[PDB]
Short mmCIF file of C-alpha atoms and ligand atoms in Angstrom, two decimals:
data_model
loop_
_atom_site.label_atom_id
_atom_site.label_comp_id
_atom_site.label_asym_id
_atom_site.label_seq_id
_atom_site.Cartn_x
_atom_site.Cartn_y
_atom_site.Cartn_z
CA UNK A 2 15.01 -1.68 -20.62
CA UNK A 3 13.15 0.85 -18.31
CA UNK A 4 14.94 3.61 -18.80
CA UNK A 5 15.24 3.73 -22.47
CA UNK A 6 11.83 3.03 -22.47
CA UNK A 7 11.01 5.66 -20.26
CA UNK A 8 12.71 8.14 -22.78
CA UNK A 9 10.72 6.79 -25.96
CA UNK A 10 7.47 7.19 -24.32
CA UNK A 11 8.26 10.28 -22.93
CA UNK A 12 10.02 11.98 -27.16
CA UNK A 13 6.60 10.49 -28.63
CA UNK A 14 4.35 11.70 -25.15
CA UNK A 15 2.44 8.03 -25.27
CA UNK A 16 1.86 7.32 -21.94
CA UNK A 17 -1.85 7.32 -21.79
CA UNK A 18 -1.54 4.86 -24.75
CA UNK A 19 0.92 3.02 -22.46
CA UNK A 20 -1.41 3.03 -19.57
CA UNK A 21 -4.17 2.58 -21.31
CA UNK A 22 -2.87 -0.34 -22.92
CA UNK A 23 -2.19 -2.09 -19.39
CA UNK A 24 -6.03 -1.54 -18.94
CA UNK A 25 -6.53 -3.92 -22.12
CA UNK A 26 -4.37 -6.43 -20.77
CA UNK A 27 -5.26 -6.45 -17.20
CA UNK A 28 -6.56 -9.72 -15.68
CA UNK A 29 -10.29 -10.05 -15.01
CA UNK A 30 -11.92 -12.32 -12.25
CA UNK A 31 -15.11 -12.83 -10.41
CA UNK A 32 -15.81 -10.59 -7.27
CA UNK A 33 -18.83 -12.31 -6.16
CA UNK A 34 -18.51 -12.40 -2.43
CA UNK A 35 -17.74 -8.66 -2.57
CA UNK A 36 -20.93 -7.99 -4.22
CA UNK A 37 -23.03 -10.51 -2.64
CA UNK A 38 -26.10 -8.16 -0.71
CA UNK A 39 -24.90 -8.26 3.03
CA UNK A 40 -21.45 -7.01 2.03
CA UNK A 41 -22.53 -3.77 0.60
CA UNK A 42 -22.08 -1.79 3.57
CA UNK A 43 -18.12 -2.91 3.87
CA UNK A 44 -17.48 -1.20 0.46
CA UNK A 45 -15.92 2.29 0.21
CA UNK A 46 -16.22 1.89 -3.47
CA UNK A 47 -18.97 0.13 -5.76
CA UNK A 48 -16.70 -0.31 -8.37
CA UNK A 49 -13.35 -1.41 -6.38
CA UNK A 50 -13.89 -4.58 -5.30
CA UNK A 51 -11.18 -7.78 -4.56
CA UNK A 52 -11.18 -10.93 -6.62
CA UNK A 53 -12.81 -14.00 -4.94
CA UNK A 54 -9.31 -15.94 -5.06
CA UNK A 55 -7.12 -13.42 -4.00
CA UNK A 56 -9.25 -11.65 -1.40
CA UNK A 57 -8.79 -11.99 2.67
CA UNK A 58 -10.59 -13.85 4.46
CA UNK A 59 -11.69 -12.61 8.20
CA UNK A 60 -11.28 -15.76 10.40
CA UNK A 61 -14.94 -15.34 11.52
CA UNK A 62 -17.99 -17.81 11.06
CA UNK A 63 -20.60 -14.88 11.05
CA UNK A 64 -19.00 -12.79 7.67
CA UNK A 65 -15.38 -13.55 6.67
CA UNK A 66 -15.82 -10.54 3.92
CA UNK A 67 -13.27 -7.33 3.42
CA UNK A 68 -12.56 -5.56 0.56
CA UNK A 69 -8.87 -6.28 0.79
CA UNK A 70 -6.64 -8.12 -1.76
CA UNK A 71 -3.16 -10.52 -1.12
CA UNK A 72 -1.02 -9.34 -3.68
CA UNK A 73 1.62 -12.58 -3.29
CA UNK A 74 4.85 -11.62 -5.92
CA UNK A 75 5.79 -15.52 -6.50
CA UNK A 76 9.09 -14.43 -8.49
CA UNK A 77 9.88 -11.15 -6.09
CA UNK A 78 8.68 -13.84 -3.41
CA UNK A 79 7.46 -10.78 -1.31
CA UNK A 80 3.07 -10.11 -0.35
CA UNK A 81 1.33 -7.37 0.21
CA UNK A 82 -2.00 -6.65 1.44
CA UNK A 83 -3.93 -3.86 -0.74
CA UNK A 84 -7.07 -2.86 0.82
CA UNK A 85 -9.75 0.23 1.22
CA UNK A 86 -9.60 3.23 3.57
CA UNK A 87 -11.52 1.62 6.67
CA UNK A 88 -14.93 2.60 7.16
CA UNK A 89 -16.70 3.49 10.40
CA UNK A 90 -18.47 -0.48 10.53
CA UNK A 91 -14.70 -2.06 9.29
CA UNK A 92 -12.33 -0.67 11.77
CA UNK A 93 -12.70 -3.59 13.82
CA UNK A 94 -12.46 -6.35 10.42
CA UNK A 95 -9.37 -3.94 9.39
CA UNK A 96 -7.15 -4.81 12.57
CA UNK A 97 -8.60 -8.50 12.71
CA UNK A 98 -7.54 -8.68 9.50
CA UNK A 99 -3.86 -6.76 10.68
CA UNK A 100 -4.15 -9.56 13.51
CA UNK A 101 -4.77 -12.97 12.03
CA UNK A 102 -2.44 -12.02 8.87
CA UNK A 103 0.49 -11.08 11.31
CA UNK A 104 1.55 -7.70 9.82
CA UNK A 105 4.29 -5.43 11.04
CA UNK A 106 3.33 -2.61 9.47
CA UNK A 107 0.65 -0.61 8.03
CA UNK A 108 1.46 1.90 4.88
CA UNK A 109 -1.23 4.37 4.59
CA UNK A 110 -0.83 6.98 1.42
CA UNK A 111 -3.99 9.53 2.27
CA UNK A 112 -5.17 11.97 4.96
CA UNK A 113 -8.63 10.61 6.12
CA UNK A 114 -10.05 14.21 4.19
CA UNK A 115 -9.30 14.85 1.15
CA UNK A 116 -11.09 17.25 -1.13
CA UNK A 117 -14.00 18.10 1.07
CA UNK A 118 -14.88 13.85 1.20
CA UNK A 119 -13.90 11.38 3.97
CA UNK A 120 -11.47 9.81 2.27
CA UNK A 121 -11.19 7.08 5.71
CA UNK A 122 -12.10 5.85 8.87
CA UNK A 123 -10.10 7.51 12.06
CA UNK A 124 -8.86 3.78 12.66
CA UNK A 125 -5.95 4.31 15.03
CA UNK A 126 -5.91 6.53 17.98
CA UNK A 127 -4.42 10.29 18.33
CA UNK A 128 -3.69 10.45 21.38
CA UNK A 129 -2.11 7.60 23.78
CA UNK A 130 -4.49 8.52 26.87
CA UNK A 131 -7.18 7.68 24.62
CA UNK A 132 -6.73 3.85 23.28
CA UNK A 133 -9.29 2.44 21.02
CA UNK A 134 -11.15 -0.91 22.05
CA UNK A 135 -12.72 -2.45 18.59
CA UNK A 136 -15.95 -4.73 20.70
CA UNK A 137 -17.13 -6.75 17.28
CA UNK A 138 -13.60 -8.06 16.58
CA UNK A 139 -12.36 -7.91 20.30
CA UNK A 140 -8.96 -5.93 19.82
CA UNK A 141 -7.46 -2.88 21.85
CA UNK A 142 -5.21 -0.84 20.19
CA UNK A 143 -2.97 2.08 21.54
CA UNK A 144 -0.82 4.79 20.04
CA UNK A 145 2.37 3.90 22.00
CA UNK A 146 4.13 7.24 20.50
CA UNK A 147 4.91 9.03 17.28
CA UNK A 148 7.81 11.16 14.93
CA UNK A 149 6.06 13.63 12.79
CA UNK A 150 8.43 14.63 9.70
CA UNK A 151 7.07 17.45 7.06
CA UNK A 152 5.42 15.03 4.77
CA UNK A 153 4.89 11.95 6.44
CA UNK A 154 4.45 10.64 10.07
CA UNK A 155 5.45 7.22 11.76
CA UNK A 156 3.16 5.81 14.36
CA UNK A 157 3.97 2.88 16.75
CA UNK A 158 1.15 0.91 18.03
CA UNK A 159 -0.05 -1.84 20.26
CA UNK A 160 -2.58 -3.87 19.38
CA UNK A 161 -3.82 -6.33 21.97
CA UNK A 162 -6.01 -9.88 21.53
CA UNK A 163 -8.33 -9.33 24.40
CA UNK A 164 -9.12 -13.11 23.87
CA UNK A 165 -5.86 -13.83 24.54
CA UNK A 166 -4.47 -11.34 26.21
CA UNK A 167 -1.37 -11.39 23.49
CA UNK A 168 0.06 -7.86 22.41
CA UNK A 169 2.10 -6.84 19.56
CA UNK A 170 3.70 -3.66 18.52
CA UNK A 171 2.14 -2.38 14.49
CA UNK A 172 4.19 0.66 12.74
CA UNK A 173 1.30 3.26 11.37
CA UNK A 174 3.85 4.53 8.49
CA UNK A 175 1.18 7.68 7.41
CA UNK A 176 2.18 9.74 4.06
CA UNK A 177 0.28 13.13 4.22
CA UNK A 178 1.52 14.80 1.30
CA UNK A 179 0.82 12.53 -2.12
CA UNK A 180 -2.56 13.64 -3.88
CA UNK A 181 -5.28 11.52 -4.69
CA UNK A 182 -5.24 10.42 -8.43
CA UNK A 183 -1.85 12.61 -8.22
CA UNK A 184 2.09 11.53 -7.53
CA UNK A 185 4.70 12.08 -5.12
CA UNK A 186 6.30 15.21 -4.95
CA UNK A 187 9.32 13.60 -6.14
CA UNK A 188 10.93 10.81 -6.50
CA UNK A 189 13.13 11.21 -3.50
CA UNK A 190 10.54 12.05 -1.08
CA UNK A 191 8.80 8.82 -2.51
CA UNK A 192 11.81 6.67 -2.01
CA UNK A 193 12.70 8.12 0.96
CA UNK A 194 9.64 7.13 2.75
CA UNK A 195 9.73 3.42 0.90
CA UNK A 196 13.22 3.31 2.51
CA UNK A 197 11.76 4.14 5.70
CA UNK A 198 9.08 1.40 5.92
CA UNK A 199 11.91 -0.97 4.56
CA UNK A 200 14.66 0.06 7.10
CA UNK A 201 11.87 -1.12 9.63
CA UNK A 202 11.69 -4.62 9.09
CA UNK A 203 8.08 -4.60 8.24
CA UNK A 204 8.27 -5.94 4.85
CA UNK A 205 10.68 -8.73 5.94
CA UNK A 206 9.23 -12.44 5.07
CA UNK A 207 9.79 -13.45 8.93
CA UNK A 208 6.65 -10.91 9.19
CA UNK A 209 3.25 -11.39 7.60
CA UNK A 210 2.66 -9.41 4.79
CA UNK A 211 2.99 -5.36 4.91
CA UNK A 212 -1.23 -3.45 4.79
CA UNK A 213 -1.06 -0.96 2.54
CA UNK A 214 -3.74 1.38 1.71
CA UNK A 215 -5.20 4.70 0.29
CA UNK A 216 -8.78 5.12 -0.12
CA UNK A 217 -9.59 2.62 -2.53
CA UNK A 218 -6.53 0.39 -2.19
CA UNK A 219 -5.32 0.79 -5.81
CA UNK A 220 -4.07 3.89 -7.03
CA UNK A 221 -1.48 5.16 -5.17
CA UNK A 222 -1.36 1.70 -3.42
CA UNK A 223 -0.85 0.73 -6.85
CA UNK A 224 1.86 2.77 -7.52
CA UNK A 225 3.67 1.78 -3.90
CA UNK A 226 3.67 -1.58 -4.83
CA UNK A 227 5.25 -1.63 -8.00
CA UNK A 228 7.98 0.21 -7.38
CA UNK A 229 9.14 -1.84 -4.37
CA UNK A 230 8.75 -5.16 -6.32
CA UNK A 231 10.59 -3.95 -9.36
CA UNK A 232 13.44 -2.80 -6.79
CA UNK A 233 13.15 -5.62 -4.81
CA UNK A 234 13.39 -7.79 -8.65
CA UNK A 235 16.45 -5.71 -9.47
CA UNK A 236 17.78 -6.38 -6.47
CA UNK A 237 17.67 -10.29 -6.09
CA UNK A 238 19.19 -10.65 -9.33
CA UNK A 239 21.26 -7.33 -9.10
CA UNK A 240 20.34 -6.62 -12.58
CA UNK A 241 18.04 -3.52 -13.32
CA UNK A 242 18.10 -4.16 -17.04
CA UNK A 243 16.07 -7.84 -15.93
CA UNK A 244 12.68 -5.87 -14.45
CA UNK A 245 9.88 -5.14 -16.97
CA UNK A 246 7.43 -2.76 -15.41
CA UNK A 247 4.63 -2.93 -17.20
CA UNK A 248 4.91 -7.03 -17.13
CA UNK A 249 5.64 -6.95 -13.33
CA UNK A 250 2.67 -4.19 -13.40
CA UNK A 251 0.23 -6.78 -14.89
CA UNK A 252 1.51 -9.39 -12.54
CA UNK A 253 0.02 -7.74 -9.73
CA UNK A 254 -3.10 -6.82 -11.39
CA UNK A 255 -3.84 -10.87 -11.27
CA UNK A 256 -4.32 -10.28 -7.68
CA UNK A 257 -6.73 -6.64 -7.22
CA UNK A 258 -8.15 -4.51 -9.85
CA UNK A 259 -7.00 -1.32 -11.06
CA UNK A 260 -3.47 -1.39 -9.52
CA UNK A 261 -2.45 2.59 -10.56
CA UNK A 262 -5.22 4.91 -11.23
CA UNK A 263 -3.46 7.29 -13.97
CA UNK A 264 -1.03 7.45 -16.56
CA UNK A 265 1.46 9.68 -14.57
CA UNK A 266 1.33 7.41 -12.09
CA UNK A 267 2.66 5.13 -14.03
CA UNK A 268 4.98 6.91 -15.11
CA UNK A 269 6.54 8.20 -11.59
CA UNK A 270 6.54 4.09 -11.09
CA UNK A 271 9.36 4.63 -13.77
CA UNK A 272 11.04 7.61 -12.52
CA UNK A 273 11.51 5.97 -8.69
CA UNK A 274 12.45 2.63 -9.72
CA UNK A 275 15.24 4.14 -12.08
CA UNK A 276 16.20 6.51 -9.46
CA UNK A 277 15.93 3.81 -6.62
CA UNK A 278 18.38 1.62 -9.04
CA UNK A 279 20.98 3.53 -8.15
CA UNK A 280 20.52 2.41 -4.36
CA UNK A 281 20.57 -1.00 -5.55
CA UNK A 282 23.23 -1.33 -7.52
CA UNK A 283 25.54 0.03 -4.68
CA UNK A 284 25.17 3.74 -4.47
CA UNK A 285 25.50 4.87 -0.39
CA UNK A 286 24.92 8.19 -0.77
CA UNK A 287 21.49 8.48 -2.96
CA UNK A 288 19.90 7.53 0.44
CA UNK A 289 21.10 10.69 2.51
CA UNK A 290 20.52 13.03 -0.79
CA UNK A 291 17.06 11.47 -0.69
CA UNK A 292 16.69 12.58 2.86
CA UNK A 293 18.43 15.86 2.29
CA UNK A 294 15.55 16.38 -0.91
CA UNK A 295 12.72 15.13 0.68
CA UNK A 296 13.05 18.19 3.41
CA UNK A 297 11.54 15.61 6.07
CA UNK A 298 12.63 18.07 8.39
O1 LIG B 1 -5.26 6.65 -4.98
C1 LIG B 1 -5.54 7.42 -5.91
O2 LIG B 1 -4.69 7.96 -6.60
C2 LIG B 1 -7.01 7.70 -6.23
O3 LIG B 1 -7.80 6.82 -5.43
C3 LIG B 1 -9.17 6.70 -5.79
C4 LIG B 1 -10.25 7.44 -5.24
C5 LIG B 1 -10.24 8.43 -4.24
O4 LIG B 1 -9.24 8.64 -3.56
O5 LIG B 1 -11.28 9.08 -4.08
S1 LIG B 1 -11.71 6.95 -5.97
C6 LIG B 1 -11.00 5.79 -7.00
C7 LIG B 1 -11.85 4.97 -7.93
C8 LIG B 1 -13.19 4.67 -7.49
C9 LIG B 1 -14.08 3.89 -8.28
C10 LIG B 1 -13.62 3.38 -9.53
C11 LIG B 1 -12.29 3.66 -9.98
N1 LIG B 1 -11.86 3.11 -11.23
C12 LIG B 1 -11.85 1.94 -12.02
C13 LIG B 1 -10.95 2.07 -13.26
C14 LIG B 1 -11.03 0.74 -14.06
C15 LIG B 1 -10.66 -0.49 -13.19
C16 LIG B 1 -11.45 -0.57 -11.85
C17 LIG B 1 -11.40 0.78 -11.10
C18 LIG B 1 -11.40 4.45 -9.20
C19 LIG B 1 -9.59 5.78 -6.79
BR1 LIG B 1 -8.35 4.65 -7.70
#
């Protein structure tokens, strides 16, 4: 049981030997196509890389490579696509990809700079007057309008087939304040923006699966991840005392490497899914006092 857990690993302070533990245990497949010469240039990262079985495939005769990962939850029955901070040459693969996989929405957890480095691709345009036509993947996409809060910022898009002519409207949800290798600044500005890309229908199953990114597509990706499918758990059953974290933690790690970077990651997976419980198991005003803490505003 999480929380009890939580409290055990917190009296003895064991949670590197926690995380390091799920390390150990984590799954480990072949990445060939990923490191196969030709796709060097579409890696951020030489040692982030998706497993052959899991990874996405572009729907393109020429290279069908991007370092992205389906995370498919079976038991949670909800998918998620995990992939890299585009790069300048995989802009165009990154919305093909958004495209052929019929995603709603896009969850992106880092600011294209961080620490002096280029952390990502501008992939989406600023500025509506100034749309953004991807030529190797034949896509237009425009920045329809945007609400900036403090911490985070929610784009809506179009993105357009120019083959087809066929349009469809992508939510940019863009999270400006969580650190790299760090955590949010609490749990109920964390939860408060989950709740936002929930309350938008883009993780519903009538959609394709939700893109979620950082810079390498693990860490705080990672962390995203698990917390929504150990809420999501909790909540099909309506019983948080059913969810193991670290097992459901491991789960996902069957589908990309390295799924949460650092121990206290981890352990802020434990802190939002205990707090989020609350929401779960019929609480109507955590949501508001999330809002309220989060000082969106
Ligand atoms: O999102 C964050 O919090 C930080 O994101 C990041 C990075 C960043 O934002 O610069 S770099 C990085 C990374 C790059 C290469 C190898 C490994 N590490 C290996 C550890 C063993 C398993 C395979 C990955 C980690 C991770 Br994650």
């Amino acid at each position: 049981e999480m929380e009890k857990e939580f409290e055990q690993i917190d009296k003895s302070g064991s949670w590197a030997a926690i995380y390091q533990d799920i390390r150990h245990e984590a799954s480990d497949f072949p990445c060939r196509v990923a490191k196969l010469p030709k796709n060097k240039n579409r890696n951020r990262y030489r040692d982030v890389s998706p497993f052959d079985h899991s990874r996405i495939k572009l729907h393109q005769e020429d290279n069908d490579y991007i370092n992205a990962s389906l995370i498919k939850m079976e038991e949670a029955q909800r998918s998620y696509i995990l992939t890299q901070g585009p790069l300048p040459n995989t802009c165009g693969h990154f919305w093909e990809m958004v495209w052929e996989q019929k995603s709603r929405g896009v969850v992106m957890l880092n600011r294209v700079m961080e620490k002096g480095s280029l952390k990502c691709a501008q992939y989406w345009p600023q500025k509506e007057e100034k749309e953004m036509i991807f030529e190797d993947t034949n896509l237009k996409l425009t920045l329809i309008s945007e609400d900036i809060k403090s911490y985070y910022t929610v784009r809506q898009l179009e993105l357009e087939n120019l083959t087809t002519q066929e349009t469809r409207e992508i939510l940019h949800f863009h999270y400006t304040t969580w650190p790299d290798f760090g955590v949010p600044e609490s749990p109920a500005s964390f939860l408060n923006f989950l709740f936002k890309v929930r309350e938008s229908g883009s993780l519903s199953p009538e959609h394709g699966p939700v893109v979620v990114h950082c810079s390498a597509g693990i860490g705080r990706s990672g962390t995203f991840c698990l917390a929504d499918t150990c809420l999501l758990l909790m909540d099909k059953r309506k019983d948080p005392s059913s969810v193991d974290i670290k097992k459901v933690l491991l789960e996902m790690r069957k589908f990309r490497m390295g799924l949460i970077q650092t121990a206290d990651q981890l352990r802020f997976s434990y802190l939002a899914v205990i707090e989020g419980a609350k929401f779960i198991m019929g609480d109507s005003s955590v949501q508001d006092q999330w809002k309220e803490l989060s000082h969106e505003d």
